[PDB]
Amino acid sequence: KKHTGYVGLKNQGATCYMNSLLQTLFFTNQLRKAVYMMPTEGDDSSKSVPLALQRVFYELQHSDKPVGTKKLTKSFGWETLDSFMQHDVQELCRVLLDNVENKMKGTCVEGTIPKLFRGKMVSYIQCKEVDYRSDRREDYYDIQLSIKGKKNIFESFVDYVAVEQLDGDNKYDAGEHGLQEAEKGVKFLTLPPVLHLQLMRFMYDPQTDQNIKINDRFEFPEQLPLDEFLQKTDPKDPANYILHAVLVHSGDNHGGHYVVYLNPKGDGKWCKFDDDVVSRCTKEEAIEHNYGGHDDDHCTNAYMLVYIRESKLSEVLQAVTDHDIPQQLVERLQEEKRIEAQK
């Protein structure tokens, strides 16, 4: 527990965003407690993702030394030298959360995942010259925001909700009305208590023919008002979000360094999580110094932000204690440790 109170994770290969993401998920206290509850007795230690995540969280909560992740990577089968380089942070997140959600089904914590991370959107198509619209609900668990050519997060949200023209030769097939010029877009109906925003600095194949990293300046705030992107708003619960995590990458596309900044209590007291080294830092370092740019004469910037709904903040970050871990689970991990101590 060091001197920040918090312990790091081991550098065990090119796992890229993984340690950052695990720290982010660990300090989503409501998720952690829920994960502690899954009926993982009788699971195979080798094969079980639920158990493997239980183990890592337990270690992060009790261990005074940097925590290993080997059994975690084995279980969801990303073990080759470059398996994390072939995926992104939002893909690993879904891998983890889907295993966990699937374990929680039929348990006293079923629905913890959609409760904390799921939001609702309306996807619509409006024809210009014919009276036809098709409104359909879409669920999301995270949001990929465009950052290229945008000054900040507000412009990104503006761009995300911008109307798109559908015109021949890209006309909408309007059924009985045949091919029709249309407008399509999305609107938000609900925003989740925990909001995962990926910033698209790392981008596809610009036709020819690399994955590249955009290191342009992109500003995000400590406090994020999203009411004006909602179809209708609640007077008693405005869509006000507070910045909780800034996942940072330093360098370019090919090779770089991965760090995450957290204020895991939600008070504005920030720590820097750099694998095994956890140290406290200024708020400027966690935030402004991660805007990116090319400024003094800079390759260090956020690719992912986590925001927490201010009204649900002090709950999402609710106290965890030792008693929140069931005895059966404590006993099992303790026995494994004892086996390991036999070398």
Ligand SMILES: [Br-]
């Ligand atoms: Br390990």
Ligand SMILES: [Br-]
């Ligand atoms: Br793979």
Ligand SMILES: [Br-]
């Ligand atoms: Br990205």
Ligand SMILES: [Br-]
């Ligand atoms: Br720039």
